[PDB]
């Protein structure tokens, strides 16, 4: 209009998603009013900002249009060439004129504003309010469940209309070892007709997918214990997705009561895709033979997943006719406290310019080629309990129960070869405020064998990459020990050289061939070539840092970045292993729990450097109360344990860890 | 700040004050003479491709400028200008030229 006003434009820089590069270190900064300022620089694979910046512009409603905030995302690192990851140059006049004079929970597409059909390079989550002298908008919403949709959830300055999506075809075959959730009332009703009571009140299970603001549902089964579907449900979403992770939240039908969820899980989209490319231009070290971090075979791909078993978790497996006080565990909130079923499916992705929803019936070929991927092996788990202290409010004798997936649960069994539980004992007062268990020289042990598919050909890689990360992490502590000693830079370089010798030595550790496995898919072809690609990448980073010399801050950045990758490269989305969950009980009442991955105690005959860091080592663990976030003023218990895990063929090797 | 060790022996006399100042605490107004000689190598600040420099001084709560006393479109302009400005200290001690 013709009436200039002091408009305060508030823009918040919140977080990035699905961006190219590794351990990227973007900074967003805008100057104004003759002042010089700097903003915090945020580093990580998926960097967070959480910073608000604003400016006061004395323009009319039709003039503030031409004075946008010059948001840029500049990636600045000391070990490699800096880059612009995208910038935003849209007008701010449209937002003021529109109702509320603001947008909430929207993302900015990151790209070159004047590059037509460039494609997204990831998205930046922001909020924007334009506050005139007579206007207010201090209230904002960032609810993460609302901006999942990739359509009209963002602002497009680059590629104003040129978005490209994909069709994600989910081939869902079957589920096994499901918990009973069917309303227990049927147990009392069926008796009216002379039917026997039971604990097998079967639900009416079906396949449901909810992602990117859209949901699909197909054929519903009834009163079924071990459901088979063979259905292909395709959900459209953006190829450069605005979601970092996909949620699996399936609501089973219940013929007796309201439909509900047996279990939930999440799958990271950063583990099965590379929309920003698989190759970063970050060849740390003195060698850059491909003008890229290393030589890749794929250099980017659509999200994809081979046939694999999905481990779902939620509230306790015990069947009841009462409302579940921990229902949220089955709604995708936090993490579950019990294993609640195994689900197998695969993903095929098509790249398209349009979104569509379709359901297809699978051919026999998709079933037979998947059924032949089914295999089972005997696994060996050992755990010893050395001590337990800092107990509070102990009313009765304490027992713990630990199980793997659906195996070792004392309430789901009548007879098992070994206990998952131990003898009940009373806690003893410490003379001040706490009680402890009088175990003395007796250190309780649990040994269990779960049965599941053989993925050891991928596991060795995980411990290989972690083992390298662990040896490199030690490099950081040693230089800091020298730093407090007021050592010279030359002394730091000496430590770097010593570290480098170990860093390159670890690069001699051979990679497993994962193409031999009959269940291997194109994703495993991706994993193998990416693993050889990144294995050479660390090999290239090695040695070169010994040849040169640097101040400590540079040496620290090198290890920190490589450590992020070495750990990230140990990631495997195809996890067919159920975790280990331990509960502390008072009598038979649950008090506190913890969830343990077995890969850190896992052993392989291939070598010590293919073993988990805690394999055969003493560990200190803590349990947390139901729906606990912090230990607070008092935590359940502090326990000292030793764990070992491996294949039954590794039995002979356990002894060195005993 | 002066931080120093003393002997634990109680027979040792205490140290004197290390520093003293004139109690010029109040509004010690001072006359400021700004001598502007010349400038060179100045960048263009707008689409016209030219720059027409002048000095604006923020002194405390007051603003001083001579925007209409300049030489247009000159690469290395000579000023030779003097500003007779008042200043109350330490209230207007912050002079941004």
């Amino acid at each position: 209009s013709d009436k200039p006003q002091d408009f305060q434009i508030r823009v918040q820089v919140i977080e990035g998603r699905q961006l190219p590069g590794v351990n990227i270190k973007p900074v967003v900064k805008v100057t104004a009013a003759g002042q010089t300022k700097r903003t915090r620089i945020h580093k990580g694979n998926s960097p967070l900002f959480n910073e608000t910046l604003f400016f006061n512009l004395f323009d009319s409603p039709g003039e503030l249009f031409d004075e946008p905030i010059f948001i840029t995302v500049v990636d600045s690192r000391s070990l490699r060439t800096d880059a612009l990851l995208g910038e935003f140059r849209m007008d701010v006049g449209t937002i003021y004129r529109e109702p509320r004079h603001a947008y909430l929970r929207k993302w900015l597409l990151l790209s070159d504003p004047d590059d037509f059909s460039a494609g997204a390079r990831g998205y930046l989550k922001t909020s924007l309010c334009v506050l005139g002298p007579g206007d207010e908008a201090p209230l904002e919403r960032k609810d993460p469940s609302e901006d999942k949709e990739d359509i009209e959830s963002n602002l497009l300055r680059p590629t104003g209309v040129a978005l490209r999506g994909a069709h994600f075809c989910l081939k869902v075959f079957r589920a096994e070892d499901l918990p009973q959730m069917d309303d227990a009332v049927m147990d009392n009703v069926k008796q009216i007709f002379g039917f026997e009571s039971n604990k097998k009140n079967l639900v009416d299970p079906f396949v449901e997918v909810s992602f990117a603001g859209k949901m699909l549902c197909s054929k519903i089964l009834e009163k079924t214990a071990n459901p088979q579907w063979n259905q292909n449900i395709t959900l459209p979403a953006m190829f450069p997705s605005m979601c970092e992770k996909m949620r699996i939240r399936i609501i089973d039908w219940d013929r007796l009561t309201h439909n509900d969820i047996v279990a939930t899980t999440y799958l990271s989209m950063s583990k099965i895709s590379a929309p920003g490319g698989e190759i970063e231009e970050e060849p740390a070290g003195a060698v850059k033979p491909s003008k890229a971090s290393d030589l890749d075979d794929y250099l980017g791909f659509l999200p994809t997943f081979g046939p694999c078993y999905i481990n779902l978790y939620g509230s306790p497996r015990e069947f009841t006719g009462f409302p579940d006080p921990y229902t949220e565990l089955n709604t995708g909130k936090g993490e579950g406290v019990a294993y609640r079923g195994r689900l197998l499916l695969s993903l095929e992705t098509k790249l398209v310019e349009h979104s569509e929803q379709k359901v297809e019936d699978l051919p026999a070929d998709d079933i037979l080629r998947v059924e032949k991927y089914l295999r089972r092996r005997k696994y060996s788990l050992f755990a010893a309990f050395y001590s337990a202290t800092m107990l509070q409010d102990v009313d009765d004798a304490i027992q713990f129960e630990v199980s793997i997936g659906n195996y070792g649960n004392k309430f789901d069994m009548t007879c098992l070869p070994l206990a998952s539980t131990t003898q009940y004992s009373r806690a003893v007062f410490d003379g001040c405020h706490y009680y402890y268990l009088p175990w003395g020289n007796v250190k309780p042990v649990v040994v269990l064998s779960s049965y599941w598919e053989d993925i050891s050909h991928r596991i060795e890689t995980q411990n290989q990459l972690l083992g390298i990360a662990d040896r490199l992490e030690a490099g950081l502590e040693q230089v800091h020990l020298a730093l407090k000693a007021q050592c010279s830079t030359e002394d730091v370089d000496s430590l770097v050289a010593q570290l480098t010798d170990e860093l390159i030595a670890g690069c001699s550790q051979p990679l497993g061939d994962i193409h031999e496995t009959p269940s291997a898919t194109h994703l495993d072809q991706y994993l193998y070539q990416l693993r050889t690609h990144h294995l050479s990448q660390i090999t290239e980073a090695a040695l070169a840092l010994k040849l040169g010399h640097s101040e400590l801050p540079a040496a620290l950045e090198q290890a920190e970045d490589w450590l992020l990758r070495l750990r990230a490269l140990a990631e495997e989305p195809q996890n067919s292993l159920p975790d280990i969950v331990i509960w502390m009980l008072q009598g038979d009442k649950r008090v506190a729990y913890q969830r343990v991955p077995a890969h850190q105690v896992l052993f392989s005959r291939r070598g010590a450097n293919y073993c988990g860091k805690n394999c055969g080592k003493l560990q200190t663990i803590f349990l947390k109360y139901p729906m606990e976030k912090v230990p607070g003023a008092r935590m359940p218990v502090q326990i000292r344990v030793k764990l070992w895990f491996g294949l039954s063929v590794d039995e002979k090797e356990f002894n060195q860890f005993a | 700040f002066k931080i120093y060790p003393l002997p634990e022996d109680p027979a040792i006399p205490m140290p004197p004050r290390q520093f003293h100042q004139l109690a010029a605490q109040g509004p010690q107004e001072c006359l400021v003479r700004i001598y502007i000689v010349r400038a060179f190598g100045l960048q263009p600040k707008d689409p016209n491709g030219k720059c027409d420099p002048y000095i604006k001084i923020s002194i405390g709560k007051k603003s001083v400028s001579d925007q209409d006393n300049y030489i247009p479109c000159t690469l290395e302009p000579v000023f030779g200008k003097m500003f007779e400005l008042t200043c109350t200290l330490p209230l207007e001690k912050d002079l941004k030229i």
Binding site: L416, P417, V442, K443, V447, L618 | K2, G26
Partner: protein, 483 residues
Amino acid sequence: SAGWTWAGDWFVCPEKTLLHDMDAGHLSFVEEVFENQTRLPGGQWIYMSDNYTDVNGEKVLPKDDIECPLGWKWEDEEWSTDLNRAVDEQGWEYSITIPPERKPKHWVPAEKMYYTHRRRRWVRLRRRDLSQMEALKRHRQAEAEGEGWEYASLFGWKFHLEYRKTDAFRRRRWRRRMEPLEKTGPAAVFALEGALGGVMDDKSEDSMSVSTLSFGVNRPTISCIFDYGNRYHLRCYMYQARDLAAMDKDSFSDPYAIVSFLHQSQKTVVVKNTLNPTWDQTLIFYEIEIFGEPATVAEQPPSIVVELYDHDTYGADEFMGRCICQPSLERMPRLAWFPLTRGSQPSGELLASFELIQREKPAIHHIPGFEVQETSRILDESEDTDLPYPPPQREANIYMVPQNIKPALQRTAIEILAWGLRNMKSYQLANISSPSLVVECGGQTVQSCVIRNLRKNPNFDICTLFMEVMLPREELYCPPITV
């Protein structure tokens, strides 16, 4: 079982063991007694002398029947009502009528007419003689005591811990212990897993779905047992804490720390009315042991948890947070600052050092089962005579930090010339008009005059600030000076 043999013969294994050394390495201990009283729902409170219980509801003797253990002396000649707990003004907790379960779970510090049971806590402090802990080894050699027999009129039910003339039957629990065959080693435990699930054959009165692989218990338990431990000598040096959050409404605290260990807990001297409390205290711990082979045990020390509490008239209910520290083999451990965290919320730091000196002589223990112990020999190396100089005392049996660990001290004078303040911005254009000059460090403070209008005069009428304190001459032991 497959891959396994018997470790020894059958031994008596009571359902619970009540024989424990609760004084092991303890110099101080606080005892408590639970006095219960009951009433009719339509009546008033009555007292019974046999209504004293433990935390588990078990019968115990009256508070006045408790005698001093050997090597100890009472600090409290009589039991006092414990008002340092969540109890009412009379020291009682109250509960609703107890059901046939006879196991009250609901207790509050309030009396209600529908409450028919109440419990009072008594508090009595005891401290050890500053001499020897030999009394602990003389009476605690046994892992467990008693024949394990319980008496009943009929076997299988209604058992009692005391004999009655009607008790025609007695019962005691026996346990067996297995050891892995050396042909497979400890790994033999996996020769049982997945194997014994198919092993069971009942052709007699002994009939169980879990027979052979286990008896009595639905599933056979497993454990590692040691006949020895690795002994250590521990000393905790608590010098000073800084920047502690206040828990009291009056912005002060009366902090004391509890040194939390696997089977030990000791209380430090409480420091009153300060958020930068100085202890200069040492706590001495004896017979600290870690189980396992010394070759790897020495490299894997336990975490030590230091829990600070703000003392108050109702007890130190306002827990200030816990700190994690580690000892070394240094004979005079260097002090360092460690964080105190409550609920994952850091609340300050403590300057302290700790030692865990390796003892050559192992702790001696017995493995359950009728076997000859592997640790048939004892290495009689000095128990505590090769230790570094022990701390000086400030009070009877109250130790200070050794001067060898303490920093050498200096008198420090901090002379500040506070000319004026700048960059005072606009705090309501009023509350920054008369800022004060105050200096605090280590609980020591400097006060000065306040000028009503420093907006037109940023300088002070009085610019003198002076502090004189004793500081550490050692930078590591000398905290950043605060202002």
